[PDB]
């Protein structure tokens, strides 16, 4: 169940002189990468990055590649224009990033479409939520915005983001249903680490879970301790699942009073754990 997403993350980086720009596109369905294209392959092509994508035949891969190659060209041109907008010399490397895709509800209604850009690590221009106005981030992007308004391009994007994006997302979820339509609950436990003669650290672990969204919180009898925790960012295990931990320093003698609570799509009921070996 639940919402899903199809997203591409696209990066072009110039290389001063007579390398053409590196162009890289990666696709994800929810938290699972499924394709890539890299210009630095010696024969570059859209390629599957998940086994279930091998179900697509030669025409899919060819059509995807032609599209990537066309967009590669787009960035070669747009990198040159930006450099002129910002009066940058040819000595320097610069970076365009683009993301686009669709979020859909459980019912398959589009929830949100995206099409946006960053230049040299900051927002450049973004298609708004309405899928027809643009937010520009600086005076250079304003020039782009007026051009894309005159041209009516938002109509084209809107058409893709409604319709096509969603249709292809539905198809991927079907082709990949054994891995994409599956939830893996966190395997959770608490570890005990001596700190001082008065204190110890309790670390609550959440391991092997999918999808990546998760809440880990420590309490003391329904008193939230979230702002007293040490946390790490959710991290990939490398096998398609994720990891997280949250830790608290507690007095010797009182460890059992503290509870770690785990919320996750895979849990109908949140988990409550303690240091109780």
């Amino acid at each position: 169940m639940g919402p899903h997403s199809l997203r591409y993350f696209v990066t072009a980086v110039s290389r001063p002189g007579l390398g053409e720009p590196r162009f890289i596109a990666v696709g994800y369905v929810d938290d699972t990468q499924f394709v890539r294209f890299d210009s630095d392959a010696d024969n570059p092509r859209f390629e599957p990055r998940a086994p279930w994508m091998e179900q697509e035949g030669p025409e899919y891969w060819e059509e995807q590649t032609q599209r990537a190659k066309s967009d590669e060209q787009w960035f070669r041109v747009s990198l040159r224009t930006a450099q002129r907008y910002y009066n940058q010399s040819k000595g320097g490397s610069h970076t365009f990033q683009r993301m686009f895709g669709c979020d859909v509800g459980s019912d398959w209604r589009l929830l949100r479409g995206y099409h946006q850009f960053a230049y040299d690590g900051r927002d450049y221009i973004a298609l708004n939520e309405d899928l027809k106005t643009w937010t520009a981030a600086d005076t250079a992007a304003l020039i782009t915005r007026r051009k894309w308004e005159q041209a009516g391009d938002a109509e084209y994007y809107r058409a893709y983001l409604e319709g096509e994006c969603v249709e292809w997302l539905r198809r991927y979820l079907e082709l990949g249903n054994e891995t994409l339509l599956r939830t893996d609950s966190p395997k959770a436990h608490v570890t005990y680490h001596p700190r001082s003669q008065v204190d110890v650290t309790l670390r609550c672990w959440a391991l092997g879970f999918y999808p990546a969204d998760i809440t880990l919180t420590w309490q003391l009898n329904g008193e939230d301790l979230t702002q007293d925790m040490e946390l790490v960012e959710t991290r990939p295990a490398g096998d398609g699942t994720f990891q997280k931990w949250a830790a608290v320093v507690v007095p010797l003698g009182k460890e059992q009073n503290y509870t770690c609570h785990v919320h996750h799509k895979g849990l109908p009921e949140p988990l409550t754990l303690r240091w109780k070996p």
């Binding site: 591409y8 859209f46 066309s70 224009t81 221009i125």
Partner: peptide, 9 residues
Amino acid sequence: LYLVCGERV
């Protein structure tokens, strides 16, 4: 399929 951009920047 992959969306090809329209007008350039």
